[PDB]
Amino acid sequence: SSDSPSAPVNLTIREVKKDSVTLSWEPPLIDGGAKITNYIVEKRETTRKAYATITNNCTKTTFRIENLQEGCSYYFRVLASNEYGIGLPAETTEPVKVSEP
């Protein structure tokens, strides 16, 4: 059916620093019609409407988002992609505040 992938599994915030966040995830349970080729990582400030893509070419299952706004709260999304399209996102349930510990 040439389906796209399902959502990445168990998206985890691995690290939260002053203005960066490291995410990790497990591959989707459904690759669809073809193998996973790349992951798309996105951010959204709690005060913005639209998600901003950080990278569309993440090939590992972990990624560090940098140059965030210290003191700002964010949602993050990771989407899985195969040759046939982009799947549904895995998203952080709570917003993450980046700040110096």
Numbering used by the authors: 2 to 102
Give me lines lifted from the publication on this model.
Titin is a protein expressed in the skeletal and cardiac, or striated, muscle of vertebrates that plays various roles in muscle structure and function. Encoded by the gene TTN, titin spans half a sarcomere (the basic contractile unit of muscle) and has various functions including preventing sarcomere over-extension (Gautel and Djinović-Carugo, 2016), acting as a molecular ruler for thick filament formation and as a hub for numerous signalling molecules (Kruger and Linke, 2011, Linke and Hamdani, 2014). Fn3 domains are only found in the A-band region of titin, where they are arranged with Ig domains in a pattern termed super-repeats, which themselves are repeated. Fn3 domains have a characteristic beta sandwich fold, with a core of hydrophobic residues as the “filling” between two beta sheets that pack against each other face-to-face.
